Amino acid sequence: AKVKQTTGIVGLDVVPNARAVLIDLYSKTLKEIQAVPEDEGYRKAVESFTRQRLNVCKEEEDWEMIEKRLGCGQVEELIEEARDELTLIGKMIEWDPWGVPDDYECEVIENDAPIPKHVPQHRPGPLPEQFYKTLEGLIA
Amino acid sequence: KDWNTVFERSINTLFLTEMVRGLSLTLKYFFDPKVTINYPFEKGPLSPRFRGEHALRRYPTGEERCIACKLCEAVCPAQAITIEAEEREDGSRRTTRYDIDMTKCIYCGFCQEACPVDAIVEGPNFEFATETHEELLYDKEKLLENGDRWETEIAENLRSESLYR
Amino acid sequence: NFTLNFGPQHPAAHGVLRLVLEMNGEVVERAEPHIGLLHRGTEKLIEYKTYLQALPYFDRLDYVSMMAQEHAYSLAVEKLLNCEVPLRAQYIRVLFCEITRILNHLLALTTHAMDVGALTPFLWAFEEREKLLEFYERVSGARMHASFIRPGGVAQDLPLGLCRDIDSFTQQFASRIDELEEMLTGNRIWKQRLVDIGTVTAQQAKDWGFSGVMLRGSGVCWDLRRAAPYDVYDQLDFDVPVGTRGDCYDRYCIRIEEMRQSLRIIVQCLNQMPSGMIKADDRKLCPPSRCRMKLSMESLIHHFELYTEGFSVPASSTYTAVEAPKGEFGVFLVSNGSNRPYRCKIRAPGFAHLQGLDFMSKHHMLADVVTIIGTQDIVFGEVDR
Amino acid sequence: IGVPPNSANLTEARRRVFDFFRAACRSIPTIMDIYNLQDVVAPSQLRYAISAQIRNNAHITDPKVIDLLIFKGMEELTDIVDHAKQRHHIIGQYVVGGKTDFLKNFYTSNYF
Amino acid sequence: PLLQDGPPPGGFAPVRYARRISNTGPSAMAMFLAVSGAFAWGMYQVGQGNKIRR
Amino acid sequence: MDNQFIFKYSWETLPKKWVKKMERSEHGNRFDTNTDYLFQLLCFLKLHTYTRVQVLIDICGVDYPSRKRRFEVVYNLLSTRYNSRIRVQTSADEVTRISSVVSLFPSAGWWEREVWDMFGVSFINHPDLRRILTDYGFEGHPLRKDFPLSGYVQVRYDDPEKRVVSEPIEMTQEFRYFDFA
Amino acid sequence: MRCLPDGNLLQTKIHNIGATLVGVDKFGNKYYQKLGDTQYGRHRWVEYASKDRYNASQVPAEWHGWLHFITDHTGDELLS
Amino acid sequence: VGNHTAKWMQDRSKKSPMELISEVPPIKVDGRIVACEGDTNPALGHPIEFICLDLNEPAICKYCGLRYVQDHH
Ligand SMILES: CCCCCCCCCCCCCCCCCCCC(=O)O[C@H](COC(=O)CCCCCCCCCCCCCC)COP(=O)(O)OCCN
Ligand code: SF4
Ligand code: SF4
Ligand SMILES: [Zn+2]
């Protein structure tokens, strides 16, 4: 419940009303995404993770609980991501990239040449469970 | 916040208290001994691995070690080595020309690593500045003179370094 | 607005630094660097070299952090070859990388300090630099361009007695760091020259491709040694210092702390250094011993092949990056199956950092431009290639 | 300011050509001053050289090639004006200020 | 051969890497008091010297 | 966020017409796209919540003379948010302008100038597209395979003109090409 | 008397005080050592035979390694 | 003194390597074969070369020019 004094990230101001801001942004997003065709995977992905985050925000009143349950950074970074998603939703309505062309071809390659253990390799660790729920919902 | 802390901040600002410590430890080094080397009477330390002026070597019999295999010419990253070779009058495989452009060379030591008979080496000399560019275009006879001049040190260094290579 | 054309034709400020500044009085309105004065066609030259002959080009890019670029190129080649490096070689590589980081940070900090008028720290630091150059020379026979780190491991094993001398250096280096700090850290003139100068937000740092200290100064916890570890960095304890203000003072403090953490890493490498081979044992990519080549046909043949044609690298392409002292140093290597790189793109952090000079120096005084250049740690060998 | 999209057809490409030619001609007095050409060559000869360069490429029909040629011409003009490399009878790539050719070439060398 | 350069049995002695704290230094009141007392007594002495010169 | 999740999620979420080729390999996840969709793809990857590809590490060209579109432009990108790297590539020829991404990544400015200098590929909407590495008035694009290693001209001081001048090259000892193949 | 104009030679004469003569080469150059610890125990130096026109290249190969701490063998032991 | 040596050697004060190696007498060997390494320490010489001594003429090591002959026959 204690107010945050710093995010520790230069230029990232503290947002003391982060819960209300997040709820408004997520509701705006869930409205504006309906301009995308329902069949498009982008719409389903956005609705999935946006609804999960919105439910977490609605349930939890303390922003520390929101940050903890989400596993996704400070509420300020969650706000940046929500604003960016809204911006992207606007550009995508305007681009109208949807549908599949008639003679659509796409080459997939799953190259399995191994690399040594000692060379630089990114190993972030497992994501929060919602990412995998979103992915499996997209596949199904 | 408090009269004492505000007073202590004001005094420290007015009396330049933190400037005193820099003066003091600058003065401490003033009386300590100096690290300067009295060149050329005194020299810096170097190792048996030091990559200096190339030299061509001979066997103790006087015969040249180089057999014109051209490996050093092939590996040289700077293309600073130029070799010509032919069958010598006694049938030996030997250079007629062995040039190193000291102004192309990057002093990497690859040629010494490539050589299968320890013929070309980078010796320990580093004091060979010249007044002309042409004196830095070493020919075979100059390299052999270098080898004759530095042979004892080169051999000692090779004995030392044979346990690593 | 008037235009001041500043080119310092001397290593006081780089040496090939060339800046066109638009000023409103003493206030900088726009800073435009002109580069290419050290563009030497490195990326074109590399395509004409075997993978071994190309290696010395990497010593000459950020020629203050020689072995780090050697390491990055070796790692890229190892990655494309699927080559396994022995553990002792891994430890030697990391040890030398952290020595290099100390060499770089000493030079950067004290050249910046001399630029803003503090003369003594330069001399003090360059004596320690001389000690570290001696370790370079003892292992490679060169003070600077060692060409010591290679695909498969390192060129030669450590000479007897080197680890003891390195330990002796580490026993006293902390006092040297403390002396540099007491000269600079608390001094009111030093703070007035660096506090709130060249402020960078985390968003700006990401937008302009900043890395290393330039990125960590803005509060972004990001270090490739932890994010994408290589060699034995995951077996080592060290902290990642991050800033809170994103200005020149924070970056200075971060560099000091990075030197302290590098000292820590070196001590750990010295204590954990194992015995064994320093070269990968695959006999198609590494030179045989001198005695083996003089005694065994297979060895002689391999030596001949390796020093004439060089090894082949199967057709592929990848990007490999390391945490160089100046930031993320990357190599985009394209192989076509032959013995020469088809394409070698070098990603230098100084290129991104110097591009950021315009937005960093906006609305600052003329005398702050050199401060901002110093905090960026620009070496034009890597900017221009 | 920014690099424009490729010309959609030959008409707009021709318009860009005319704009480039005007910009090149209007910079002639600056070039005369920078290279000190008052006693070396007339300004009209510079105009004539620019127009001749434009005319030698009059057979091009692809708008993209024309756009690239215009971009290169702009860069060359900028380097000539902003970063002049004075020689004597030469600005950039242009020389400023009874026997057939075979016999002359034969007297010269064996590589024609 | 079989001998390689490395740590001694037990490793090397521990080394400090963190900053050491030197000292606070002269007290503020002490400096204020020394300067103020020197000013007062010295100005009295200036008066005495001026009287003698007169 | 591992390279299996990125490959699968990008297949599920990206508009299909943006990606012609998708490679999953330890050498890096790779997306190939037509030139007309490069900008939108990069904007999507930067802005989307599940990708957050915020850092443009570099742009480089590769010359393939045997191809109708000889140039391949490679975009190396990084997500500090998810600790992941992505490579996005598109092909180009000598006269076809491709979109600049400066408005997406300010760091692209100089990398695009470099591609233009080295290879001759031009970038639409780039605010200041001029050579950045070569000498002023340089002719050609040195990183093209057909450009000779030593170039075409060299410089020397000319005492009669009292200046440094450029002449066609003359090599005392020519570069020796050792063919070990 | 060369000490007055040549301060470089003066420093060698001063630091020769208390030194041990290690050997003399074929050119007459004299080699001295101290066995202390000031420059991390590096206390080897050469007094050139020519008090004027001395030059670093006058050190012969047998003594060059000793002078540069490359080897602990003096010029005499190398020659034997 | 020959044409080969005259291409590089412009000093006649010393003997050329060809004359110097020719002055070394052939090494007598008990046996029909000998291995030459060019140095007492093999790692400091040349790759080992096995030389047959079946011919009456002295056999020459192709790396260091040392000559060998059969001691008895
Ligand atoms: C036998 C030895 C004799 C030695 C004689 C010479 C002494 C050495 C003098 C040289 C010392 C080092 C010089 C280099 C420092 C130059 C930089 C000065 C910067 C400066 O003036 O800062 C101002 C305070 O100092 C000042 O203001 C300086 C003036 C201080 C006058 C004190 C005034 C009140 C004293 C109390 C009197 C009370 C008693 C009488 C009733 C405040 O500016 P800033 O921007 O740096 O702020 C930041 C504060 N951290
Ligand atoms: S030192 Fe390196 S560059 Fe110089 S000649 Fe030897 S191999 Fe070539
Ligand atoms: S110096 Fe060595 S590597 Fe070079 S040609 Fe002679 S024998 Fe071969
Ligand atoms: Zn032999």
Short mmCIF file of N, CA and C in Angstrom, two decimals, chain B residues 11-19 21-23 25-26 28-29 35 45-52 65 69-79 106-108 110-119 161-162 164-165, chain C residues 48-49 52-57 60 120 124 127 134 137-143 145-148 150 155-160 176 178-179 182-183 186-189 191 287-291 293-294 300 303-304 306-308:
data_model
loop_
_atom_site.label_atom_id
_atom_site.label_comp_id
_atom_site.label_asym_id
_atom_site.label_seq_id
_atom_site.Cartn_x
_atom_site.Cartn_y
_atom_site.Cartn_z
N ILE B 11 30.13 25.18 6.74
CA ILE B 11 31.59 25.22 7.02
C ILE B 11 32.34 24.41 5.95
N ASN B 12 31.94 23.16 5.69
CA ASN B 12 32.68 22.34 4.73
C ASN B 12 32.74 23.01 3.37
N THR B 13 31.64 23.63 2.94
CA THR B 13 31.65 24.35 1.67
C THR B 13 32.57 25.56 1.71
N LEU B 14 32.56 26.31 2.81
CA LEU B 14 33.33 27.55 2.89
C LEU B 14 34.82 27.27 3.05
N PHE B 15 35.18 26.23 3.80
CA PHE B 15 36.57 25.96 4.14
C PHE B 15 37.23 24.96 3.20
N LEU B 16 36.54 24.55 2.13
CA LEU B 16 37.13 23.69 1.10
C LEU B 16 37.74 22.42 1.70
N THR B 17 37.01 21.81 2.63
CA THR B 17 37.57 20.70 3.41
C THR B 17 37.95 19.53 2.51
N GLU B 18 37.11 19.21 1.53
CA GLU B 18 37.41 18.07 0.67
C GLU B 18 38.55 18.35 -0.30
N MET B 19 38.85 19.62 -0.58
CA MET B 19 40.01 19.93 -1.41
C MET B 19 41.32 19.64 -0.70
N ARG B 21 42.15 16.91 1.09
CA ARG B 21 42.58 15.52 0.97
C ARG B 21 43.33 15.28 -0.33
N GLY B 22 42.85 15.87 -1.43
CA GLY B 22 43.57 15.77 -2.68
C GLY B 22 44.95 16.38 -2.60
N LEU B 23 45.06 17.56 -1.98
CA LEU B 23 46.36 18.18 -1.78
C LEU B 23 47.27 17.26 -0.98
N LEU B 25 47.23 13.89 -0.52
CA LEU B 25 47.75 12.65 -1.07
C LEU B 25 48.53 12.91 -2.37
N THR B 26 48.33 14.08 -3.00
CA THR B 26 49.31 14.50 -4.00
C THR B 26 50.67 14.75 -3.37
N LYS B 28 51.86 13.33 -0.70
CA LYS B 28 52.48 12.09 -0.23
C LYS B 28 53.34 11.45 -1.32
N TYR B 29 52.83 11.42 -2.56
CA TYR B 29 53.61 10.86 -3.66
C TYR B 29 54.85 11.68 -3.98
N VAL B 35 59.20 5.94 -10.59
CA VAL B 35 59.18 4.71 -11.37
C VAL B 35 59.87 4.86 -12.71
N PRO B 45 61.46 -4.43 -18.82
CA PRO B 45 61.51 -5.89 -18.88
C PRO B 45 60.81 -6.44 -20.11
N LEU B 46 61.37 -7.51 -20.67
CA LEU B 46 60.78 -8.23 -21.79
C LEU B 46 60.87 -9.72 -21.51
N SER B 47 60.15 -10.50 -22.30
CA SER B 47 60.06 -11.93 -22.12
C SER B 47 60.70 -12.68 -23.29
N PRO B 48 61.02 -13.96 -23.11
CA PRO B 48 61.54 -14.75 -24.25
C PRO B 48 60.58 -14.83 -25.42
N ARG B 49 59.29 -14.55 -25.21
CA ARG B 49 58.30 -14.60 -26.27
C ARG B 49 58.22 -13.31 -27.09
N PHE B 50 58.98 -12.28 -26.72
CA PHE B 50 58.83 -10.97 -27.34
C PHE B 50 59.02 -11.05 -28.85
N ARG B 51 58.12 -10.41 -29.59
CA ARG B 51 58.12 -10.45 -31.05
C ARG B 51 58.77 -9.17 -31.57
N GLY B 52 60.07 -9.25 -31.86
CA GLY B 52 60.79 -8.13 -32.43
C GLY B 52 61.24 -8.34 -33.86
N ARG B 65 68.98 -22.78 -42.43
CA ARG B 65 67.86 -23.68 -42.02
C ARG B 65 66.72 -23.61 -43.06
N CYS B 69 60.05 -23.65 -48.18
CA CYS B 69 58.74 -24.30 -48.23
C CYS B 69 57.62 -23.31 -48.51
N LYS B 70 57.86 -22.02 -48.29
CA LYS B 70 56.93 -20.93 -48.57
C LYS B 70 55.72 -20.92 -47.63
N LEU B 71 55.77 -21.65 -46.52
CA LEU B 71 54.67 -21.60 -45.56
C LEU B 71 54.54 -20.22 -44.92
N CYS B 72 55.66 -19.61 -44.55
CA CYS B 72 55.60 -18.28 -43.93
C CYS B 72 55.01 -17.26 -44.89
N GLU B 73 55.37 -17.35 -46.17
CA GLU B 73 54.80 -16.46 -47.17
C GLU B 73 53.29 -16.66 -47.29
N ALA B 74 52.83 -17.91 -47.21
CA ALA B 74 51.40 -18.18 -47.34
C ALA B 74 50.61 -17.64 -46.15
N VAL B 75 51.10 -17.85 -44.93
CA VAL B 75 50.33 -17.49 -43.74
C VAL B 75 50.36 -16.00 -43.45
N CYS B 76 51.36 -15.27 -43.95
CA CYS B 76 51.58 -13.88 -43.53
C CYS B 76 50.35 -13.02 -43.78
N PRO B 77 49.70 -12.54 -42.71
CA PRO B 77 48.46 -11.74 -42.86
C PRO B 77 48.66 -10.43 -43.63
N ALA B 78 49.89 -9.92 -43.66
CA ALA B 78 50.16 -8.65 -44.31
C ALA B 78 50.78 -8.79 -45.69
N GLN B 79 51.01 -10.02 -46.15
CA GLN B 79 51.71 -10.28 -47.42
C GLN B 79 53.04 -9.53 -47.48
N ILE B 106 53.16 -6.78 -39.59
CA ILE B 106 52.37 -6.41 -38.37
C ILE B 106 52.99 -7.05 -37.11
N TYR B 107 54.12 -7.72 -37.26
CA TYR B 107 54.87 -8.27 -36.12
C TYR B 107 53.99 -9.20 -35.29
N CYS B 108 53.26 -10.07 -35.98
CA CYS B 108 52.33 -11.00 -35.36
C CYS B 108 52.97 -12.32 -34.95
N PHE B 110 53.17 -15.00 -36.77
CA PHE B 110 52.61 -16.16 -37.54
C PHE B 110 53.70 -16.90 -38.37
N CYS B 111 54.58 -16.11 -38.99
CA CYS B 111 55.62 -16.75 -39.80
C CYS B 111 56.48 -17.69 -38.96
N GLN B 112 56.88 -17.24 -37.77
CA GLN B 112 57.66 -18.09 -36.88
C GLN B 112 56.86 -19.32 -36.47
N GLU B 113 55.57 -19.17 -36.22
CA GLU B 113 54.75 -20.38 -35.90
C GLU B 113 54.67 -21.32 -37.11
N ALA B 114 54.59 -20.78 -38.30
CA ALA B 114 54.38 -21.65 -39.45
C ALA B 114 55.63 -22.43 -39.83
N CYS B 115 56.81 -21.89 -39.54
CA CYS B 115 58.04 -22.44 -40.10
C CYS B 115 58.34 -23.82 -39.53
N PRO B 116 58.51 -24.85 -40.36
CA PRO B 116 58.74 -26.20 -39.85
C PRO B 116 60.18 -26.49 -39.43
N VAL B 117 61.12 -25.57 -39.64
CA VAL B 117 62.52 -25.85 -39.33
C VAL B 117 63.15 -24.75 -38.49
N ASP B 118 62.32 -23.91 -37.86
CA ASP B 118 62.79 -22.83 -37.00
C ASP B 118 63.76 -21.90 -37.75
N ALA B 119 63.49 -21.66 -39.03
CA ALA B 119 64.39 -20.85 -39.84
C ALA B 119 64.15 -19.36 -39.64
N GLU B 161 61.51 -21.56 -24.57
CA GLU B 161 60.13 -21.61 -25.04
C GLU B 161 59.74 -22.95 -25.66
N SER B 162 60.67 -23.89 -25.82
CA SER B 162 60.32 -25.17 -26.42
C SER B 162 59.40 -26.00 -25.53
N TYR B 164 56.64 -24.91 -24.18
CA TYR B 164 55.28 -24.43 -24.33
C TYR B 164 54.71 -24.65 -25.72
N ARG B 165 55.56 -24.70 -26.74
CA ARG B 165 55.09 -24.81 -28.12
C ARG B 165 55.32 -26.21 -28.68
N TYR C 48 39.33 -11.27 -47.86
CA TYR C 48 40.46 -11.79 -48.61
C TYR C 48 41.43 -12.59 -47.76
N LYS C 49 41.09 -12.83 -46.49
CA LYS C 49 41.95 -13.54 -45.56
C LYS C 49 41.33 -14.88 -45.17
N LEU C 52 42.20 -17.60 -39.85
CA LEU C 52 43.37 -17.28 -38.97
C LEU C 52 43.99 -15.92 -39.36
N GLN C 53 44.19 -15.67 -40.64
CA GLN C 53 44.83 -14.39 -41.05
C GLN C 53 43.93 -13.18 -40.68
N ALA C 54 42.64 -13.38 -40.57
CA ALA C 54 41.69 -12.28 -40.25
C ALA C 54 41.79 -11.89 -38.76
N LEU C 55 42.22 -12.81 -37.93
CA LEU C 55 42.18 -12.59 -36.48
C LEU C 55 42.89 -11.32 -36.04
N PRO C 56 44.15 -11.02 -36.41
CA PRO C 56 44.78 -9.72 -36.03
C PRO C 56 43.98 -8.44 -36.39
N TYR C 57 43.08 -8.47 -37.38
CA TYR C 57 42.24 -7.25 -37.62
C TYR C 57 41.42 -6.87 -36.36
N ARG C 60 42.90 -4.55 -33.72
CA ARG C 60 43.07 -3.15 -34.18
C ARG C 60 41.75 -2.38 -34.34
N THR C 120 47.19 14.46 -12.88
CA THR C 120 47.88 13.39 -12.16
C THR C 120 47.28 11.99 -12.32
N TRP C 124 49.28 8.17 -12.76
CA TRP C 124 49.10 7.11 -11.77
C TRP C 124 48.51 5.86 -12.42
N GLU C 127 50.84 3.82 -14.99
CA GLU C 127 51.79 2.85 -14.41
C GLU C 127 51.16 1.47 -14.20
N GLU C 134 52.55 -5.84 -19.33
CA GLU C 134 53.61 -6.88 -19.09
C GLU C 134 53.01 -8.30 -19.10
N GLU C 137 52.46 -9.19 -22.71
CA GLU C 137 53.78 -9.51 -23.35
C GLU C 137 54.31 -10.87 -22.86
N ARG C 138 54.15 -11.18 -21.58
CA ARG C 138 54.65 -12.49 -21.06
C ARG C 138 53.94 -13.69 -21.73
N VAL C 139 52.64 -13.57 -22.00
CA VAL C 139 51.91 -14.70 -22.64
C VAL C 139 52.05 -14.70 -24.17
N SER C 140 52.07 -13.54 -24.81
CA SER C 140 51.99 -13.46 -26.30
C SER C 140 53.28 -12.98 -26.93
N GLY C 141 54.13 -12.29 -26.19
CA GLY C 141 55.29 -11.64 -26.78
C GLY C 141 54.96 -10.27 -27.37
N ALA C 142 53.74 -9.78 -27.23
CA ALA C 142 53.32 -8.43 -27.64
C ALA C 142 52.69 -7.67 -26.45
N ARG C 143 52.98 -6.39 -26.30
CA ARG C 143 52.37 -5.51 -25.24
C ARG C 143 50.88 -5.25 -25.53
N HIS C 145 48.90 -5.98 -29.26
CA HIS C 145 48.18 -6.80 -30.24
C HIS C 145 48.63 -8.25 -30.09
N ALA C 146 48.14 -8.90 -29.05
CA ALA C 146 48.61 -10.25 -28.69
C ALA C 146 48.24 -11.29 -29.73
N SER C 147 47.07 -11.18 -30.36
CA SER C 147 46.54 -12.27 -31.21
C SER C 147 46.65 -13.59 -30.40
N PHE C 148 46.37 -13.51 -29.10
CA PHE C 148 46.56 -14.66 -28.18
C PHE C 148 45.31 -15.58 -28.12
N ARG C 150 42.30 -17.45 -29.65
CA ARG C 150 42.04 -17.99 -31.01
C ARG C 150 40.87 -18.98 -31.02
N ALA C 155 46.59 -19.26 -27.91
CA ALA C 155 47.79 -19.67 -28.71
C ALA C 155 48.80 -20.51 -27.91
N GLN C 156 49.07 -20.11 -26.67
CA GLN C 156 50.08 -20.80 -25.88
C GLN C 156 49.65 -20.83 -24.42
N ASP C 157 50.25 -21.75 -23.67
CA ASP C 157 49.97 -21.82 -22.25
C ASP C 157 50.70 -20.71 -21.49
N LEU C 158 50.25 -20.47 -20.26
CA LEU C 158 50.85 -19.44 -19.43
C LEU C 158 52.29 -19.82 -19.07
N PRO C 159 53.22 -18.88 -19.09
CA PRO C 159 54.56 -19.16 -18.57
C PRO C 159 54.53 -19.37 -17.07
N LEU C 160 55.44 -20.22 -16.58
CA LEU C 160 55.53 -20.45 -15.14
C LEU C 160 55.80 -19.14 -14.40
N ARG C 176 45.09 1.43 -5.51
CA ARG C 176 45.20 2.32 -6.66
C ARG C 176 43.83 2.86 -7.08
N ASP C 178 41.30 3.23 -5.11
CA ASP C 178 40.92 4.15 -4.04
C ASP C 178 41.59 5.51 -4.22
N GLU C 179 42.86 5.52 -4.63
CA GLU C 179 43.55 6.78 -4.86
C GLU C 179 42.92 7.56 -6.01
N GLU C 182 39.64 9.04 -4.62
CA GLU C 182 39.77 10.17 -3.70
C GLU C 182 40.20 11.41 -4.47
N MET C 183 40.99 11.23 -5.53
CA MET C 183 41.33 12.35 -6.40
C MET C 183 40.09 12.93 -7.06
N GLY C 186 34.90 12.72 -4.69
CA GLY C 186 34.29 13.70 -3.82
C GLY C 186 34.61 15.15 -4.14
N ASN C 187 35.44 15.40 -5.14
CA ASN C 187 35.90 16.76 -5.40
C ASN C 187 34.78 17.60 -6.01
N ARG C 188 34.56 18.80 -5.46
CA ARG C 188 33.43 19.61 -5.89
C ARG C 188 33.57 20.06 -7.34
N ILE C 189 34.80 20.29 -7.81
CA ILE C 189 35.00 20.66 -9.21
C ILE C 189 34.66 19.49 -10.12
N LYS C 191 32.56 17.00 -9.49
CA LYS C 191 31.11 16.86 -9.51
C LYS C 191 30.45 17.93 -10.36
N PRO C 287 46.72 -26.25 -34.40
CA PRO C 287 48.10 -26.60 -34.73
C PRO C 287 48.64 -27.69 -33.82
N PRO C 288 49.36 -28.66 -34.37
CA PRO C 288 50.06 -29.63 -33.52
C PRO C 288 51.26 -28.99 -32.84
N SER C 289 51.76 -29.67 -31.82
CA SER C 289 52.97 -29.23 -31.15
C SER C 289 54.15 -29.25 -32.12
N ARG C 290 55.17 -28.45 -31.81
CA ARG C 290 56.36 -28.41 -32.66
C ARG C 290 57.03 -29.77 -32.74
N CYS C 291 57.17 -30.45 -31.60
CA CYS C 291 57.79 -31.77 -31.59
C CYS C 291 56.95 -32.79 -32.35
N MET C 293 54.79 -32.30 -34.98
CA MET C 293 54.99 -31.97 -36.40
C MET C 293 56.38 -32.42 -36.90
N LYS C 294 57.40 -32.45 -36.06
CA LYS C 294 58.76 -32.87 -36.47
C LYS C 294 58.90 -34.39 -36.36
N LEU C 300 52.45 -33.31 -39.27
CA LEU C 300 53.11 -32.45 -40.31
C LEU C 300 52.06 -32.04 -41.37
N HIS C 303 49.75 -29.48 -39.97
CA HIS C 303 50.43 -28.19 -39.85
C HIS C 303 50.53 -27.48 -41.20
N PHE C 304 50.97 -28.21 -42.23
CA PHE C 304 51.04 -27.67 -43.58
C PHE C 304 49.69 -27.14 -44.03
N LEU C 306 47.04 -26.31 -42.19
CA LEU C 306 46.53 -25.24 -41.35
C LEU C 306 47.19 -23.91 -41.67
N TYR C 307 48.50 -23.93 -41.95
CA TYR C 307 49.19 -22.67 -42.20
C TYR C 307 49.20 -22.27 -43.67
N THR C 308 48.77 -23.14 -44.59
CA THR C 308 48.60 -22.68 -45.96
C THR C 308 47.15 -22.33 -46.27
#
